[PDB]
Structures are given as C-alpha cells and as structure tokens.
Design an enzyme around this catalytic site. Structure first.
Site, PDB file in Angstrom:
ATOM      1  N   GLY A 110      28.704  -9.627 -12.811  1.00  0.00           N
ATOM      2  CA  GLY A 110      28.149  -8.813 -13.926  1.00  0.00           C
ATOM      3  C   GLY A 110      26.448  -9.030 -13.886  1.00  0.00           C
ATOM      4  O   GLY A 110      25.828  -8.382 -14.795  1.00  0.00           O
ATOM      5  N   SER A 111      26.024  -9.449 -12.776  1.00  0.00           N
ATOM      6  CA  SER A 111      24.371  -9.968 -12.608  1.00  0.00           C
ATOM      7  C   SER A 111      24.117 -10.487 -13.829  1.00  0.00           C
ATOM      8  O   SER A 111      22.871 -10.309 -14.422  1.00  0.00           O
ATOM      9  CB  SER A 111      23.699  -8.476 -12.610  1.00  0.00           C
ATOM     10  OG  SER A 111      24.383  -7.792 -11.579  1.00  0.00           O
TER      11      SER A 111
ATOM     12  N   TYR B 178      38.800  -9.384 -14.173  1.00  0.00           N
ATOM     13  CA  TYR B 178      38.774 -10.919 -13.941  1.00  0.00           C
ATOM     14  C   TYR B 178      40.033 -11.407 -14.181  1.00  0.00           C
ATOM     15  O   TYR B 178      40.585 -12.355 -13.475  1.00  0.00           O
ATOM     16  CB  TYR B 178      37.428 -11.473 -14.218  1.00  0.00           C
ATOM     17  CG  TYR B 178      36.361 -10.991 -13.781  1.00  0.00           C
ATOM     18  CD1 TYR B 178      36.041 -11.240 -12.412  1.00  0.00           C
ATOM     19  CD2 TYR B 178      35.119 -10.319 -14.506  1.00  0.00           C
ATOM     20  CE1 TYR B 178      34.760 -10.734 -11.849  1.00  0.00           C
ATOM     21  CE2 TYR B 178      34.004  -9.761 -13.848  1.00  0.00           C
ATOM     22  CZ  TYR B 178      33.646 -10.045 -12.714  1.00  0.00           C
ATOM     23  OH  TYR B 178      32.717  -9.562 -12.130  1.00  0.00           O
TER      24      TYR B 178
ATOM     25  N   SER C 210      29.679 -12.536  -7.126  1.00  0.00           N
ATOM     26  CA  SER C 210      28.145 -11.919  -7.476  1.00  0.00           C
ATOM     27  C   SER C 210      27.412 -13.069  -8.029  1.00  0.00           C
ATOM     28  O   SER C 210      26.945 -13.760  -7.432  1.00  0.00           O
ATOM     29  CB  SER C 210      28.581 -10.620  -8.544  1.00  0.00           C
ATOM     30  OG  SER C 210      27.197 -10.046  -8.880  1.00  0.00           O
TER      31      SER C 210
ATOM     32  N   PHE D  21      26.472   3.228  -4.313  1.00  0.00           N
ATOM     33  CA  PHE D  21      26.600   2.789  -5.830  1.00  0.00           C
ATOM     34  C   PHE D  21      25.740   1.858  -6.387  1.00  0.00           C
ATOM     35  O   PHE D  21      25.684   1.353  -7.494  1.00  0.00           O
ATOM     36  CB  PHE D  21      28.193   2.349  -6.195  1.00  0.00           C
ATOM     37  CG  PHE D  21      29.296   3.072  -5.573  1.00  0.00           C
ATOM     38  CD1 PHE D  21      29.412   4.282  -5.803  1.00  0.00           C
ATOM     39  CD2 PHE D  21      30.109   2.694  -4.694  1.00  0.00           C
ATOM     40  CE1 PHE D  21      30.410   5.093  -5.588  1.00  0.00           C
ATOM     41  CE2 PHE D  21      31.050   3.145  -4.136  1.00  0.00           C
ATOM     42  CZ  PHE D  21      31.298   4.749  -4.503  1.00  0.00           C
TER      43      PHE D  21
ATOM     44  N   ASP E  28      26.458  -3.224   1.643  1.00  0.00           N
ATOM     45  CA  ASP E  28      25.642  -3.440   0.454  1.00  0.00           C
ATOM     46  C   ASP E  28      24.294  -3.662   0.729  1.00  0.00           C
ATOM     47  O   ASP E  28      24.162  -4.208   1.822  1.00  0.00           O
ATOM     48  CB  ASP E  28      26.583  -4.553  -0.434  1.00  0.00           C
ATOM     49  CG  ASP E  28      26.097  -5.825  -0.174  1.00  0.00           C
ATOM     50  OD1 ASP E  28      25.323  -6.092   0.758  1.00  0.00           O
ATOM     51  OD2 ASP E  28      26.797  -6.859  -0.536  1.00  0.00           O
TER      52      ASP E  28
ATOM     53  N   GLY F 119      32.639  -4.521  -4.706  1.00  0.00           N
ATOM     54  CA  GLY F 119      34.027  -4.372  -5.413  1.00  0.00           C
ATOM     55  C   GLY F 119      34.812  -4.142  -4.709  1.00  0.00           C
ATOM     56  O   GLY F 119      35.977  -3.228  -4.971  1.00  0.00           O
TER      57      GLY F 119
HETATM   58  C1  LIG Z   1      24.879  -2.212 -11.455  1.00  0.00           C
HETATM   59  C2  LIG Z   1      25.724  -2.668 -10.615  1.00  0.00           C
HETATM   60  C3  LIG Z   1      26.224  -4.156 -10.779  1.00  0.00           C
HETATM   61  C4  LIG Z   1      27.628  -4.065 -10.157  1.00  0.00           C
HETATM   62  C5  LIG Z   1      27.315  -3.205  -8.991  1.00  0.00           C
HETATM   63  C6  LIG Z   1      26.750  -2.114  -9.761  1.00  0.00           C
HETATM   64  O1  LIG Z   1      26.197  -0.894  -9.009  1.00  0.00           O
HETATM   65  C7  LIG Z   1      27.880  -1.136 -10.440  1.00  0.00           C
HETATM   66  C8  LIG Z   1      28.462  -2.101 -11.636  1.00  0.00           C
HETATM   67  C9  LIG Z   1      28.640  -3.549 -11.355  1.00  0.00           C
HETATM   68  C10 LIG Z   1      29.872  -3.934 -10.653  1.00  0.00           C
HETATM   69  C11 LIG Z   1      31.035  -4.164 -11.843  1.00  0.00           C
HETATM   70  C12 LIG Z   1      32.006  -5.141 -11.520  1.00  0.00           C
HETATM   71  C13 LIG Z   1      32.152  -6.063 -10.277  1.00  0.00           C
HETATM   72  O2  LIG Z   1      32.022  -7.343 -10.581  1.00  0.00           O
HETATM   73  C14 LIG Z   1      30.825  -5.611  -9.328  1.00  0.00           C
HETATM   74  C15 LIG Z   1      30.767  -6.715  -8.221  1.00  0.00           C
HETATM   75  C16 LIG Z   1      31.031  -4.328  -8.650  1.00  0.00           C
HETATM   76  O3  LIG Z   1      31.783  -3.859  -7.739  1.00  0.00           O
HETATM   77  O4  LIG Z   1      30.597  -3.205  -9.539  1.00  0.00           O
HETATM   78  C17 LIG Z   1      29.615  -5.462 -10.254  1.00  0.00           C
HETATM   79  C18 LIG Z   1      28.237  -5.409  -9.598  1.00  0.00           C
HETATM   80  C19 LIG Z   1      27.381  -6.685  -9.832  1.00  0.00           C
HETATM   81  O5  LIG Z   1      27.472  -7.119 -10.820  1.00  0.00           O
HETATM   82  O6  LIG Z   1      26.664  -6.994  -8.858  1.00  0.00           O
END
Ligand SMILES: C=C1C[C@]23C[C@@]1(O)CC[C@H]2[C@@]12C=C[C@H](O)[C@@](C)(C(=O)O1)[C@H]2[C@@H]3C(=O)O
Lengths: 434, 146, 334, 109
Positions: free
Chosen positions: C106-107, C118, C182, C229, C280, C311
């Site tokens: 979730g950064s 999760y 992440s 994305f 990615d 994801g």
């Molecule tokens: C801005 C973001 C951050 C994402 C990628 C995205 O482009 C879209 C939303 C996030 C996210 C949501 C859930 C997953 O943990 C993650 C790895 C993903 O695929 O997409 C998450 C991923 C991340 O947290 O790195």
C-alpha cells in the site's frame, strides 16, 4: 450472477456488465486526465459517495458529478490468571445447564475466591457474572452517565441526525415519531442543523413515546418544555406531543393523529429499543406492520452487533461473556470518576438482566445485521445507503476523546459500525419503503 | 481652492482642495456650506497636524507601485511612543481610516508575542488585580502558557 | 489498450478501480485525506468458526501504540466442533511447523491488516502452505512517518518469538519466516537486518515486488510510464510522504545499497526469495537489489516474471499465481 | 490612558493566541476581550464555502453561548493536530451540534 473472485475480494460487480464497467472506468480516466487538480479537489471534498461496493453506480455518480455465523474474538495480554477464571466460569455455566446446583454454588464460591486476588477488568466482569449466576441459582442517572462517559449514544444520535437531515431536503412540512424519547439529547442538534439550512427552516412536529414513569412523573412534559424553549430561542416553529405506553405493540396508525403524507413527511426514529420487543411473540411483526401503515420516508435503526437470542443457554452465555469482557476492556483508559463507576453499574445491571432473567421478562435479546435484514425485508422494506459525511462526522466524534485511540468506524452494505479496533459493537442503518 | 488650517498654539498651515476631501468630516462640513474663514481645530497639536498633512499629501500624490507606498509608510513609523499616541488620537479625531488602521497595525505588531510581564514594561501601566483574581484569570487562560 | 491484452478483464477492472480511487484522493500539498480512504476501503472481520479449513482471530500485542495483529491457523482435525476461545492458543502439533510473519503493501499509506485482499491472500497462504500466518498492522504515513513501521515490525517479531504455544518439539525453538509485499518487502528486509544483529534467528525472507528507489531514473521508468497502471508521479509522492522532511531518495530506507548504508558482507542474513514482475516500472530497482544481495555473499533465488504486472497475486485466474505459490511452498518446507 | 474604542481598534488586527494572552493584562483590556465581533472574526477565518449567511450564524451562535466558548471548547481541539487546515461545513456542523447540546444541558426547566 456475481463474479466469484470479485465477490470474495469485496466488490459487487455483475458478470454481464464487466465490459460496461471497464468502459466507464476508461471514460472516467480520460475525464480526470482532462481536468486539473480542481476536479480532484471537488470529488475529494464537495461530493459524497454511496455504497462503494457497487462499482457501476459509484462510477456513474462520479461521471455525473465530474461532467454535469461469524464470531469475532480479540485477546488481551492482561490474562495472566484469567484462564482459570474462564475455566471455572464455563464449568459453572455447564453445571447449571446440567441440573446440578451444589457444584454450581461451589464453583461460584471458587470464582469469588479467585477474583479476590485479581486486578483488572477481568475482575469486574467476573464479579458481575458471578453475581448473575448467584441470582440464577437463587431463582432455580444510569443513561445520563453512560452517555457522558461512553461514545455509543453520541455516535448513534449523530448518525441518525445525519440520515434524517439528508432525508429531509426539499420538504416544507416534517414530522418525527420517536420510539425512545429518553432525555431528548438528539433533537437539539437536528433542530440547529435544520435552522441553518438553505431554503428556510420548515415546520417541525415531534411526537415522542416513552416508558411509563416509575414514580408517576412528567419527564416527557419537562423535555417538551425545554425543547420548546430552545426552539423559541433558535426561531423555529415547533409542536410537541408526548405519549406514555408500556410497549410498542399497543400502538396504532390511527391513534397517532397522523396528517396526510402527501402534505407532510414522516420520519421514524429508534435507538436501542427494537431488541426489547423481541421477547413477546408477534409484537415485532405488528410494529413493522404499523410502521408500513404509517408510510414514512426513512426509518433509522441502531442496534448492538451481537447474537444473544440463541435457544441454547450455554452459547448465549459464552458470546455474552466475550462481548462484555471486550466492552469492559475498552473502558480502562478513562480516568476514574463517579461517571465511570456508575456506568459500570449500568453494565452490571445489563449483564445481570441478560444472564439471570428468562422468559418474557428478559428483554435483552440482541441480534446482528443479517437477521435484522431478513426481518425487515419480509415486510417490504428496502435499505437506504448512508454517505461518507456521516462517516467523517463519526470519525471526528471518536477523535474528540482519548486522542482518537482504539475505537474505529467501518462501513459495509450501506450501514455503519462503531467498534473496538476490529470488533463491531454498534450498528446503525436506515431503511425505507420498497 | 486653498484652505487655511489653524492649530491650537497659533500656527497656520496651507492645504489644497482635493486633499480636503480625504478627511470625510471636512467634506461633510463642506457639503453643508457655511464655511468662509479658516476652520479652527481646538484640541490638536501643531506638529501632529503637520505630520498628518505630510501623510495625506504623500498619499494623494502617490494615488494620482504598491511596494513604494509600503516602503514609505514603513519609513513613516520611525516615531517614538508619544508621537504614536498623539497620531492615533488625531486620526481618531479627524477620522482618517487609513492612518488609524496603519497606527493600530503597528501597535498590534509591537505588542504581538508579548506576555503579561512584557506588556506592563512596554506601556508602563499599573497592575490593579489582586492575587486571587490574577490567579483566576491566569488559570482561565492557562492554555496560552504552554 | 496495452493493459487490456496482458491481464484478464477482472484483474484489469480491479486495478483500474484502485488506481482511480487513489487518484481522486492524492493531494498536491502532501496531506492525506484519511476519512474518505477509510470509507472507500473494504474490510472484513475475523471468524473463529473454521471456513474451508482456516479460522482467524485478533491479538492486541501493544496498547500504547495500538499495535494489533491477526493470526490464521489451520482447522483442528481432532475437534469436530469449532474451536473455542480457550482453544485459540492451543499448542501446535507437528515435528516442525513454520510461522510466517507477513507485511502488506500500500506504499506505506494504504490498506490494513484486516483488508479483504490481504485476508484472502493470508487464507490462501495458510491453505496451500499448511502453516500459521501472523499479519501485522503497522502505522501508516504521512501522519506517522519513518521509523514507525520498523518499530512495529520489531515489536511484532519479538512477540512472535517469545510465545510458547507456537513452538517445535525438534529443537524447542520457533521457525519464523518473514514475508512482505510491496512496502511489506521493505519492512521485512529492514526488520530482518535489525534482527540479524540482535539474537533472534530468522529462517528466510519472501519478497513479493519489493519497493526500493533512488534519485537516478532507470531505463524502465521512461518506457513504462503510465502504461501498466503505475506512473512515476505517485512514486515520488509516496516516497516524499515517507522519508523525513528534507531528505532525498538516497536514504538507507529507500536504497539499502547506498554509500551511507552498512555493507551486508560480514553480517548474518537469512536466505531470500525475491519475485520480480517484468512489466512493472520498478523492475530495474528490484533486479539491482537482487544482484546486490548476490554480490554481498548471501543466498538469493531470483524469479523473473516475463509477462506479469503488479498485483498478479490477488486473483487465481492466471498462471503465475500457481508458480509463485508452489515456489513458496518448496522454499518454506525445505 | 487609552480609551475603550481605540483598544478595540488595536485588538482588531491581532490573532487568537495574542488576544487570549492580552485578555489578562488589565481590566480595560479584559473588557475589550469579550466583545463578540473580535471572536466572530477570528472564528470565521478558516471557514470557506459555509453555505449560509453570516447574520444567521452569528445570531444562532450568540443565542447558544457566544463565539468565545465556540472557539475555546471545540474548534481549538480540532485545530490542535493540524493547525494549517481549513474547516469545511462538516466541522462547523459538528461544533454547532456540540454547542447546542451543551446549551440544552446547562439550561433549567
Ligand atoms: C498507486 C498504486 C499503488 C499500487 C499500484 C497503484 O498503481 C494502484 C494501487 C496500488 C495497489 C493496490 C493493491 C496492491 O497491494 C498493489 C500491489 C497493486 O497491485 O495495486 C498496490 C500498489 C502498491 O501499493 O505499490
């Protein structure tokens, strides 16, 4: 039907509308890319969202705005000697269920002796449960302090006010039927908010129903006079009318003196009062039928999210034990005062009535969201989804005290829950005619 | 049109017509006529009158760029306590909103960040509160002391 | 148009919805709109009743900082009735049982331990791995910046290590595997590095798309910008909301192989399994981290994913999910 | 030797904390501290897009207990975590609801 993977993931998307959802997502992407951060701010603060699980309707609303059973257990480290306490307590409950009384008395004495040396909320809940078991063996200010020291009533009142206010927009004549007047600590906020509306405060009619006075008093009259004085000080019209009744099963749609609905809207309110009625066979169906006959525009229901209506005594006893131990744990950071002690007395009376009493005398039979849903949906009632403004106001409320620690608010299926961390405690929802 | 102003001491000053309209009290007197001789200002000191004359003349000259006036009115306020108080009183009396606003802003700036200890030293005022009431008011505003 | 041909329709819709929801929410100033984020997030509750062989419950490890964690363990074979609350802390049966301390992504500023995605991932991990899983709920930036998450992970690891009902007969110790996705990869790496020089022995690390960065833009950020994305702007925004004010992306928390960071050579570090998605934007940084681990002298196995995006481990309708799960099961049960 | 109105003009252009600190220095300053206009203007400094006229809000707040209590009871705790944050309509609704409930509490039958 629904997509299985999305459904378990937590989203409600039909299988036949996947392409349409993708097309709407791409259109929203281009629309947001076209606009600057001003549109992002507008959707972040000015707009409101309903039912985020429904992706189709959420995306449609965004596009329109831009371009106009299950049991939960939480463990606490402060259980150094609590294991023996639960052992003895469950053994006593089982012995009670096994028609053995001498063993139950000996186990009650053992629980008392063990709780003598304990120090914690475990001690308090164990003492109250031991007293309840003793009462069962022998048979075989409250609300003000609770409001002042706990956030349950405040959260319920504010969410109810937000729902009713959102349902009372664009109307000139309103009427409110309250099934639990209590002290009237919810209506001042509603009237103040309705006074500062955009269009002018409409006529406000209030009809309250309360329990019979144990001392033959005029509490309803005093509350009505106080509310009328406040309304005069705020410059809003107000008509008040109080009612005395033992239960809600004796009400009638013709005895409330209801004005025609085409010229005046009706809103029904209920807070922690619909579970006291489940003890009488057939009452709840009659009350729901009279509510349907009233033909209101909104029905606010606030309840406690736990199952306490099980036929088996032992199951009820166990889940009530765990819910009330969680509740007593959640009240350790509050500083000592008479309010805290008197609210523990209130909760002790709660436990004692829930455990020792039986039959129609027992009124403390809670249920979770699901069964209430089937009960409401059997009479032609549909849900009404709440918005994020109520969520945010609840967040601020919980942040006023204890620096917003512990208690959290969550949304699911158009309803809100206030709980200790991840354990739901209070559920608020709104319904309407289908 | 040239207007003669007489001070309390006896000094005479010459002012113009457009600047006269800046003082709305003088304008209100003018639209009611009945003004032939020099208008006397009894309770006004001469040097304060000269200072406000310079201020209004400079303001009308500049009005007929914002940083220039900001710097000028910044340089104007190099006066002590007595001149500041006299100028505030004069701006109240002849009712010039801009001069009063500037003087009150300057005084608010110099009282900013002060304490009930520093203000009394700044203005040399007498503390007339008893220990009980002083403790009470300190407790009422105790949130400001942390 | 490029994204719709790499991933199935369902994953595309889910990731697009997540991206849009996070885009309506980001603030140029640096502040975080917490309330609407909590409203829009989908959460679930623990269920002590076994569901498909898995049940769960919550434990409040710390009260001063509200440090909470969720535990998943397999259904009891000898108990036909659902496990009781007293039976929740039953000692484990089996000569060697591994426990996985898991950190979500979730950064550092999104999602939670009780999030639906999760929860489902941990349930599938328990089902396929046949192991106990502890999901930690660490504090989230920018309201709680560095180093809150590392402290939360350290406290959770100390709590897990000191338990007596999660033990092994063979050696009378606990077999702990750290895993993260992440941001969880960064958290797991930092906690493992901290624990290496503290006494707690760690068995292995499982990194799923670890998050690492630096100032020098790599050759993958330019070509893949906003095509799968993920864009670059969000990367700088998230890294700015994490690190202390007045710091660049060469902080050791952002780049372990930095001149200011401590060398991994000569220090104890467990084996690791890094999973890298090719399509990615942060592919090059992940590969650089893997090669740095290889050159430091520590064991590391690389699983380069040729045509997988971010994801990919959220839906079982693709082919790489099975490969990753099988590889993890082989890694832990060795 | 300052008079009453000039002190009001001075304290017009001062902030909330300095006004609170200057409410204690002397009796005349104390009297000029409680005028509702100063606290009204201080309260309506971080409010944008309220949705209602200022006169109605002022009258209601005066009826419910004034702006000084409104600022010192609910607004300051709200702004304590993030001092640089604008309060929208929802914070105003919450604060006004709390003030009205308090006024209902304190008032006698
Ligand atoms: C801005 C973001 C951050 C994402 C990628 C995205 O482009 C879209 C939303 C996030 C996210 C949501 C859930 C997953 O943990 C993650 C790895 C993903 O695929 O997409 C998450 C991923 C991340 O947290 O790195």
């Amino acid at each position: 039907m629904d997509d299985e993977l999305l459904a378990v993931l937590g989203y409600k998307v039909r299988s036949s509308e996947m392409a349409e959802v993708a097309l709407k997502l791409e259109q929203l992407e281009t629309m947001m890319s076209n606009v600057q951060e001003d549109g992002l701010s507008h959707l972040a603060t000015d707009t409101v969202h309903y039912n985020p699980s429904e992706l189709y309707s959420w995306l449609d609303n965004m596009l329109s705005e831009l371009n106009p059973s299950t049991r939960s257990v939480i463990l606490v480290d402060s259980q150094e000697n609590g294991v023996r306490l639960v052992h003895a307590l469950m053994a006593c409950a089982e012995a009670i269920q096994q028609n053995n009384l001498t063993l139950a008395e000996a186990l009650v004495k053992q629980i008392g002796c063990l709780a003598v040396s304990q120090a914690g909320a475990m001690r308090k809940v164990a003492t109250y449960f031991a007293e309840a078991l003793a009462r069962r063996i022998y048979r075989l200010t409250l609300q003000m302090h609770f409001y002042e020291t706990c956030p349950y009533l405040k959260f319920a009142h504010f969410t109810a006010n937000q729902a009713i206010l959102e349902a009372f927009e664009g109307k000139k004549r309103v009427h409110v039927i309250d099934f639990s007047m209590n002290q009237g600590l919810q209506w001042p906020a509603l009237m103040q908010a309705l006074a500062l509306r955009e269009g002018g405060p409409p006529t406000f009619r209030l009809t309250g129903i309360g329990p019979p006075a144990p001392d033959n008093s005029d509490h309803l009259h005093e509350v009505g006079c106080k509310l009328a004085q406040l309304a005069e000080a705020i410059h809003v019209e107000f008509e008040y009318r109080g009612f005395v009744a033992n239960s809600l099963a004796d009400l009638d749609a013709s005895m409330l003196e209801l004005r025609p609905s085409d010229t005046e809207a009706v809103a029904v309110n209920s807070v922690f009062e619909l579970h006291k009625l489940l003890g009488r066979p057939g009452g709840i169906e009659k009350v729901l039928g009279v509510v349907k006959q009233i033909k209101p525009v909104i029905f606010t229901v606030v309840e406690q999210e736990s199952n306490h209506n099980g036929p088996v005594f032992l199951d009820r006893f166990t889940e009530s034990l765990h819910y009330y131990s969680t509740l007593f744990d959640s009240l350790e950071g509050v500083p000592n005062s008479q309010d805290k002690v008197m609210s523990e007395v209130y909760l002790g009376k709660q436990i004692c009535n829930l455990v020792a009493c039986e039959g129609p005398d027992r009124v403390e039979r809670h249920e979770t969201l699901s069964q209430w849903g089937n009960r409401f949906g059997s009479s032609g009632l549909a849900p009404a989804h709440l918005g994020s403004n109520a969520f945010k106001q609840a967040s601020m409320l919980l942040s006023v005290f204890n620096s917003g620690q512990g208690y959290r608010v969550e949304e699911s299926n158009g309803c809100l829950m206030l709980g200790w961390h991840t354990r739901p405690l209070i559920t608020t929802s709104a319904w309407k005619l289908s | 049109k040239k207007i003669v102003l007489k001070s309390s001491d006896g000094e005479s000053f010459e002012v113009e017509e457009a600047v006269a309209l800046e003082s709305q009290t003088i304008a209100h007197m003018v639209e009611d006529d009945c003004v032939d001789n020099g208008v006397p200002l009894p309770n006004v000191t001469s040097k304060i009158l000269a200072k406000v004359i310079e201020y209004c003349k400079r303001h009308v000259e500049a009005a007929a760029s914002d940083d220039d006036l900001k710097a000028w009115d910044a340089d104007f306020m190099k006066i002590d306590q007595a001149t500041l108080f006299e100028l505030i009183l004069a701006a109240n009396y002849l009712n010039i909103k801009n001069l009063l606003d500037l003087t009150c802003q300057t005084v608010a700036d110099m009282i900013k960040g002060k304490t009930p200890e520093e203000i009394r030293t700044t203005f040399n005022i007498k503390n007339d509160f008893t220990p009980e009431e002083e403790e009470e008011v300190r407790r009422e505003n105790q949130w400001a002391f942390e | 148009i490029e994204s719709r041909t790499v991933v199935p329709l369902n994953t595309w819709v889910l990731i697009s919805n997540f991206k849009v929801a996070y885009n309506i929410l980001r603030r140029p100033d640096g502040t975080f709109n917490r309330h609407l984020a909590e409203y829009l997030d989908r959460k679930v509750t623990a269920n002590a009743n076994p569901v498909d062989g898995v049940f769960s419950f919550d434990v409040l490890i710390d009260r001063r900082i509200n440090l909470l964690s969720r535990v998943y363990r397999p259904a009891y074979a000898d108990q036909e009735q659902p496990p009781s609350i007293l039976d929740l802390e039953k000692p484990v049966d089996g000569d060697i049982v591994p426990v996985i301390l898991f950190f979500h992504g979730g950064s550092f500023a999104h999602s939670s331990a009780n999030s639906a995605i999760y929860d489902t991932l941990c349930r599938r991990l328990v089902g396929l791995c046949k192991c106990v899983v502890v999901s930690v709920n660490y504090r989230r930036a920018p309201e709680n910046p560095y180093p809150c998450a590392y402290d939360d992970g350290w406290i959770a690891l100390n709590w897990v290590n000191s338990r007596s009902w999660l033990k092994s007969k063979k050696d009378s110790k606990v077999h702990i595997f750290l895993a993260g996705d992440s941001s969880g990869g960064n958290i797991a790496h930092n906690v493992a590095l901290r624990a290496g020089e503290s006494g707690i022995d760690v068995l292995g690390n499982i990194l799923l798309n670890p998050m690492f960065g630096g100032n020098e833009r790599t050759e993958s950020e330019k070509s893949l910008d906003g095509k799968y994305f993920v864009t670059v702007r969000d990367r700088d925004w998230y890294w700015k909301a994490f690190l202390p004010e007045g710091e660049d992306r060469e902080h050791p928390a952002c780049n372990p192989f930095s001149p200011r960071g401590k060398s991994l050579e000569g220090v104890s570090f467990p084996k690791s399994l890094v999973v890298v998605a090719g399509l990615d934007l942060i592919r090059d940084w992940q590969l650089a981290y893997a090669e740095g681990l290889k050159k430091a002298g520590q064991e590391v196995k690389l699983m380069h994913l040729e045509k997988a995006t971010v994801g990919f481990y959220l839906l079982p309708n693709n082919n790489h999910f099975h490969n990753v799960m099988d590889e993890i099961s082989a890694f832990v049960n060795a | 030797n300052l008079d009453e109105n000039l002190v009001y003009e001075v304290l017009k252009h001062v902030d909330a904390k300095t006004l609170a600190m200057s409410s204690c220095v002397s009796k005349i300053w104390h009297k000029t501290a409680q005028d509702e206009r100063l606290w009204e203007l201080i309260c309506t400094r971080h409010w944008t897009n309220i949705g209602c006229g200022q006169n109605q809000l002022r009258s209601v707040v005066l009826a419910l207990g004034g702006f000084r209590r409104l600022h010192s009871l609910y607004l300051w705790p709200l702004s304590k975590p993030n001092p640089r944050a604008r309060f929208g309509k929802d914070e105003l609704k919450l604060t006004l609801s709390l003030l009205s409930i308090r006024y209902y509490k304190k008032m006698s039958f």
